[PDB]
Design a protein around this ligand. Structure first.
Ligand SMILES: O=c1ccn([C@@H]2O[C@H](COP(=O)(O)OP(=O)(O)O[C@H]3O[C@H](CO)[C@@H](O)[C@H](O)[C@H]3F)[C@@H](O)[C@H]2O)c(=O)[nH]1
Ligand SMILES: [Mn+2]
Length: 542
């Protein structure tokens, strides 16, 4: 339990000094907390937050007070009580699996992954969120970036083998052209919406693609119909009927990412947390697979020469090689194992007949009304998997974190963009505003906001993580445990986050698909792309 009123009076007792009125407020609020048997978990948390806030008021009022050592210890007790509140009062998680595929037609590979969850969780409703107004964003982004690639290499027709026209310079020069084309489209988009506010996104995009890039609406219209048919056949759910999301403060940020930045991961970040707040259930990226039965490979020891990640990948590659649940699944890592280890996998999998003894099921899950649980990998927490009851306290904290982070971003970015300058001057203006606002509380966050204009187009640009991804989740948990809102500097240690982590037995994250990012790319991928583009251009494979 947590100390009662007279227990705290013993802790904060002054041998000869009067009961200040800031002190009795703490005492009264504490007494009220222990008389809250008829109140909800969330109401109890809000009362602990009141108690913490009054304690801070006292401490700040009488800075060298003899009580302050006891009261600071009391504040540690309050955090412990929150974790115990979280862990000891659970309620059922709605049986929904939420997936997101927006911006274009859904791939057979995503469907195949989704279907494995379906096969082992028949009692779960499954939504695949899509945007019926925005099937053409991916085509738009591909058309612009491919035009930019060609314009770049044209500019450099003769230094194709000049060892100095290296992959870093190519992406630097391409970024300049992408920005001018991207600004061209955004300007056209804002014009069409001002002239007509009831045009849908795909309307504006297919006219733009027709005028500027010579594609023809007939084909794009057939694509749209084919994409609507496919997603309807596969548990599709239209964002455009997700009322509360659409009417919310976050919808503008969703549309900023979808329409202006062409960042479908970030748009999906904004959408997934509202699905969790408004509906409850479990969110999953389409490259995630069900967890593997914990006993399955227990007889097979991991080779000393192999990383834990490598081993995890080969476990899924073995299932697929022998059961073929998913077509064309890679065996690249499994094939590097000793024949004897490979044979150990074969005989384990030969002993099993039904998918249910390969992949486990989610079953009846329960969580705290306070929390959102989050997946993790060796790098840290990762929002590729999320569990929450409807309207959890943390889901609201996370929505607020994301909204505040976008407000800070757009305060600096919108004035920079409003001056119709090129990529380099806009970048410099933007970064200068961001730096003028940077402080000890936000440094690393602001450091990453400064790369925002390049997300998706330049290697190693990871701003989304700080804006709508995991860091916003970390900050929300810190908000919860510090009885506040708006944390910007993360001081939680890994131990702290473990209270909010999803059990590894519930998701298999080391999948083939999880190895290639859809919104970012690293230097090796950048370099291989650059030398393939060169030979595509040479061969005139535009
Ligand atoms: O054309 C497209 C391309 C992608 N998406 C969405 O973006 C999601 C994430 O794609 P992906 O797995 O490649 O991102 P990831 O590299 O793991 O990035 C992490 O960080 C991301 C940023 O925080 C976070 O979104 C993600 O969960 C992390 F794992 C994907 O599951 C779709 O929902 C889409 O809807 N349409
Ligand atoms: Mn992924």
């Amino acid at each position: 339990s947590l100390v009662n009123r007279k227990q705290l009076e013993k802790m904060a007792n002054v041998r000869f000094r009067t009961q200040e009125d800031e002190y009795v407020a703490i005492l009264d609020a504490l007494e009220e907390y222990h008389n809250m048997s008829e109140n909800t978990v969330v109401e109890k948390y809000l009362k602990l937050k009141d108690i913490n806030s009054l304690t801070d008021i006292y401490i700040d009022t009488y800075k060298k007070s003899g009580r302050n050592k006891a009261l600071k210890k009391f504040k540690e007790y309050l955090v412990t009580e929150v974790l115990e509140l979280k862990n000891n009062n659970l309620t059922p998680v709605e049986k929904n699996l939420h997936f997101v595929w927006i911006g274009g037609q859904i791939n057979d590979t995503a469907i195949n992954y989704i279907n494995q969850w379906k096969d082992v969780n028949s009692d779960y409703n499954v939504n695949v969120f899509y945007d019926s107004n925005a099937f053409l964003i991916n085509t738009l982004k591909k058309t612009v970036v491919e035009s930019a690639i060609n314009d770049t290499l044209e500019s450099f027709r003769e230094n194709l083998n000049d060892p100095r026209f290296d992959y870093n310079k190519f992406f630097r020069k391409r970024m300049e052209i992408i920005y001018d084309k991207q600004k061209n489209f955004i300007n056209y988009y804002k014009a069409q919406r001002e002239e007509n506010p009831e045009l849908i996104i795909d309307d504006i995009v297919k006219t733009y693609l027709s005028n500027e890039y010579s594609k023809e609406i007939d084909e794009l219209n057939t694509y749209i119909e084919e994409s609507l048919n496919k997603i309807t056949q596969n548990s599709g759910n239209d964002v455009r009927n997700f009322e509360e999301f659409k009417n919310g403060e976050s919808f503008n940020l969703y549309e900023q990412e979808l329409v202006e930045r062409w960042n479908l991961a970030a748009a999906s970040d904004i959408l997934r947390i509202s699905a969790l707040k408004e509906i409850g259930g479990m969110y999953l990226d389409v490259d995630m697979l069900p967890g593997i039965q914990p006993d399955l490979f227990e007889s097979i020891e991991k080779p000393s020469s192999v990383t834990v990640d490598f081993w995890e990948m080969t476990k899924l590659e073995a299932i697929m090689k022998y059961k073929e649940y998913i077509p064309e699944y890679t065996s690249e890592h499994f094939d590097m194992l000793d024949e004897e280890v490979q044979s150990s996998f074969e005989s384990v999998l030969a002993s099993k007949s039904d998918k249910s003894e390969i992949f486990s099921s989610l079953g009846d899950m329960e969580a705290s009304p306070l929390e959102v649980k989050i997946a993790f990998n060796s790098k840290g927490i990762i929002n590729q998997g999320l569990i929450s009851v409807k309207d959890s306290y943390c889901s609201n904290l996370i929505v607020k974190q994301i909204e505040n982070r976008y407000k800070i971003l757009n305060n600096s970015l919108n004035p920079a963009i409003s001056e119709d300058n090129d990529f380099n001057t806009t970048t410099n203006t933007f970064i200068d505003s961001i730096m003028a606002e940077a402080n000890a509380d936000n440094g690393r966050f602001m450091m990453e906001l400064g790369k925002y204009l390049r997300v998706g187009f330049f290697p190693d640009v990871k701003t989304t993580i700080n804006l709508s991804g995991p860091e916003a989740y970390a900050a929300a948990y810190q908000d919860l445990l510090m009885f506040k809102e708006g944390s910007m500097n993360i001081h939680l240690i890994e131990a702290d986050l473990r209270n909010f982590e999803i059990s590894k037995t519930n998701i298999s994250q080391s999948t083939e698909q999880e190895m290639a990012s859809l919104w970012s790319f690293d230097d090796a991928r950048a370099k291989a792309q650059f030398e393939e583009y060169k030979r595509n251009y040479f061969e005139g494979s535009l």
